[PDB]
């Protein structure tokens, strides 16, 4: 079932006082006239933010669960509520398949727990919440308002104040509700023109990009637009498909014949074998744990599998004792000066 | 490979975006790719099949909004500068040398220019937005003859204002 999300869902973006000014700001807001899913529960995606809202007559909804796998495998938010002590404990609790906590539930067998915080309690009354996660901060905004004999979103405009800025720093990837109607919506990045009257308490807003007339209005920061020609945006065509073309060749390079040679040459008379006309799969060498160090210069080690080169030479020699670090561009010492000297613009990697 | 569309291609590590079309530039056997005056590819030789593909950047341009004014109507026209109408409010489409104009109806009779658009075309009247070729002023002729002179019999005094910073 669906209903139409009205002009609801605007909140204070920055905690900065401003007065008598029209300020244009970009953040994640709920688009006007969006639908929002109506439920009468299953697990829903969290993506980039949720406009959770619910109406009721009593305190039937008592909590929320946030996490990634909800199986003690990752850290999971368990913000839960009770009559007078709201408790937040972000720990790897192992939750049941269908939690429904007069006794206690789903938060049993908590091996160890890392965070606890206490606040004053949250919950004919409409209760709006906004949950966003920005750079390691779980932010909740809320407002309570007297609803009347209406069976939907009550029409009109009201801004939401901040309540907590808990420093949890986890992902959160999926969500579920606890125990019966809700309005789940999703936020998207859109630009709004916000009107502050004089004490700073947002009095109006204009949703840009709604239509051609609305775009001119935001650009001029005015509610009336004079006669003329205005430049408002830039058109850019996006590509439709990718095409990958490569030379026809299936030969494999003898990497086993260089790294596993019976006897290596001395550093004063190092060997230089030329490898060509083959397919070189470098993912095994990258993942192989047998190497002590793997420092690549010039190219990053994980994109070297896509790029192509005309020829590669593998110079193999043995060095013992100190100075092993001297094999690098622009280095000095007995080894670099008399034994093996690398060019200044060398592009490649040394493995030892 | 798909031709005649803006695509993001990758030829042996050479990447870019453009429309790939047939060409008649006779590359000699020893050259593989040609470059512009700028350090970017102008054409390229395909592998496996050894053919010459031309690369032309896909079309782009600015968007301008034409509006009559808060005293008349909420209907507006949108001008896509320097783009053709053969690619994307959706009522009428008129192709001009200034770009592709959408939303304005073309009327054959000329009037004095009001809102300039460019390239000689100006553009509310008769319940709709109209576009037309601008008039240069009223046409009149003087009754020239080899033996007639006109002398004024009266005068008027006028006052003008000139403002300079």
């Amino acid at each position, epitope marked *: 079932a669906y209903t139409n999300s009205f002009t609801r869902g605007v909140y204070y973006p920055d905690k900065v006082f401003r007065s008598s000014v029209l300020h244009s700001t970009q953040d994640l807001f709920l688009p006007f006239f969006s639908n929002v899913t109506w439920f009468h529960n299953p697990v829903l995606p969290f993506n980039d933010g949720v406009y959770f809202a619910s109406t009721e007559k009593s305190n039937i909804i008592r909590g929320w669960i946030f996490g990634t796998t909800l199986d003690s495998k990752t850290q999971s938010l368990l913000i839960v509520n009770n009559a007078t002590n709201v408790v937040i404990k972000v720990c790897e609790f192992q939750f049941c398949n269908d939690p429904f906590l007069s006794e206690f539930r789903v938060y049993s067998s908590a091996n160890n727990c890392t965070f606890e915080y206490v606040s004053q309690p949250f919950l004919k009354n409409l209760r709006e919440f906004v949950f966003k996660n920005i750079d390691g901060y779980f932010k909740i905004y809320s407002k309570h308002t007297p609803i009347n004999l209406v069976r939907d979103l009550p029409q009109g405009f009201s801004a939401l104040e901040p309540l907590v800025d808990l420093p949890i720093g986890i992902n959160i990837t999926r969500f579920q509700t606890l125990l019966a109607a809700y309005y789940v919506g999703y936020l998207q990045p859109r630009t709004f023109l916000l009107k502050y009257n004089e004490n700073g308490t947002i009095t109006d807003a*204009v949703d840009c990009a709604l239509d051609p007339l609305s775009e001119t209005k935001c650009t001029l920061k005015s509610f009336t637009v004079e006669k003329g020609i205005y430049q408002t945006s830039n058109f850019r065509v996006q590509p439709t498909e990718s095409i990958v073309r490569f030379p026809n060749i299936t030969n494999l390079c003898p990497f086993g014949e260089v790294f596993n040679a019976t006897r290596f040459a001395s550093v004063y008379a190092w060997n230089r074998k030329r490898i060509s006309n083959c397919v070189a799969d470098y993912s095994v060498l990258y993942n192989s744990a047998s190497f002590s160090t793997f420092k690549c210069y010039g190219v990053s080690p994980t994109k070297l599998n896509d790029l192509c080169f005309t020829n590669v030479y593998a110079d193999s020699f043995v060095i013992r004792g100190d100075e092993v670090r001297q094999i690098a561009p622009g280095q000095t010492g007995k080894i670099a000066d008399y034994n093996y000297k690398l060019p200044d613009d060398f592009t490649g990697c040394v493995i030892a | 490979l798909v031709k005649n569309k803006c695509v993001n291609f990758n030829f042996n590590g050479l990447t870019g975006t453009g429309v790939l079309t047939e060409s008649n530039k006779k590359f000699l056997p020893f050259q593989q790719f040609g470059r512009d005056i700028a350090d970017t590819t102008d054409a390229v030789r395909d592998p496996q099949t050894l053919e010459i593909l031309d690369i032309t950047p896909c079309s782009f341009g600015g968007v301008s909004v034409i509006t009559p004014g808060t005293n008349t109507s909420n209907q507006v026209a949108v001008l896509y500068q320097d783009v053709n109408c053969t690619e994307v409010t959706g009522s009428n489409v008129f192709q001009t040398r200034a770009g592709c104009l959408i939303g304005a109806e073309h009327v054959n009779n000329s009037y004095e220019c009001d809102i300039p658009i460019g390239a000689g075309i100006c553009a509310v009247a008769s319940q709709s937005i109209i576009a037309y070729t601008m008039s240069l002023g009223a046409e009149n002729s003087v009754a020239y003859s080899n033996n007639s002179i006109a002398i004024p019999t009266n005068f008027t005094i006028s006052v003008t204002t000139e403002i300079l910073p």
Partner: antibody, heavy 119, light 110 residues
């Protein structure tokens, strides 16, 4: 643009009356239509509105299932019909338009109005 | 009855200034904007004042608005004969879930 309403109507109590308000071409989609009356010796009162592109309607709480507002896209005309006409329903009816990308309503252009008399 | 209360009558002398007021409650005026409409009988009304501090495109520099607490006012300078009309104040009401209009005032120029 302009809004053109139907002519004056004379009706008997207990009957039904239908009043239309025809608009321009672009005045649908991103525009709402509001209905306002003014009883003699009284202040103006709001009834409801309809968004043609969304076909969703709102009604004043005092009009409990007596008013229904509909609109069609093919002809570009909006309709109002009221049931159970009584003596106190005599007034002048207006249709006025709103811009949809503004949170707080503000009527911009008003129609000329029509007069309905009951006796 | 109109939720917003306005003085039934008001008068002013030519050439001077006059002030009109519109008083309401905390549920409508205190939380939402106000709008001012000019009405002449036999004709359609017009928008004088929008978002309670923002002037429209057409009206010239003279009409000014202000809002304070639960009361709002409109100021007219350079009063002239054609200003004879009715004035209405309107605002959204949260409790009634609809728009509520004022009672209207007759302004008389002596």
């Amino acid at each position: 643009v302009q809004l053109v309403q139907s002519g004056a109507e004379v009706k008997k109590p207990g009957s039904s009356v239908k009043v239309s308000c025809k608009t321009s071409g672009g005045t649908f989609n991103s525009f709402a239509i509001n209905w306002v009356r003014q009883a003699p010796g009284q202040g103006p009162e709001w009834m409801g509105r309809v968004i043609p592109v969304l076909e969703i309607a709102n009604y004043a709480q005092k009009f409990q299932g007596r008013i229904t507002i509909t609109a069609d896209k093919s002809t570009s005309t909006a309709y109002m019909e009221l049931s159970s006409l009584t003596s106190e329903d005599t007034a002048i009816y207006y249709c006025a338009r709103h811009h949809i990308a503004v949170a707080q309503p503000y009527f911009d252009y008003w129609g000329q109005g029509t007069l309905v008399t009951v006796s | 009855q109109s939720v917003l209360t306005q003085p039934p009558s008001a008068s002013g002398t030519p050439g001077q200034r006059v002030t009109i007021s519109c008083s309401g409650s905390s549920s409508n005026i205190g939380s939402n904007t106000v709008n001012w409409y000019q009405h002449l009988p036999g004709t359609a009304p017009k928008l004088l004042m929008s978002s309670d501090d923002q002037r429209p495109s057409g009206v010239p520099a003279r009409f000014s608005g202000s809002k304070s607490g639960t009361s709002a006012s409109l100021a007219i300078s350079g009063l002239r004969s054609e200003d004879e009309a009715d004035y209405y104040c309107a605002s959204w009401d949260d409790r009634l879930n609809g728009v509520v209009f004022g009672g209207g005032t007759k302004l008389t120029v002596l």
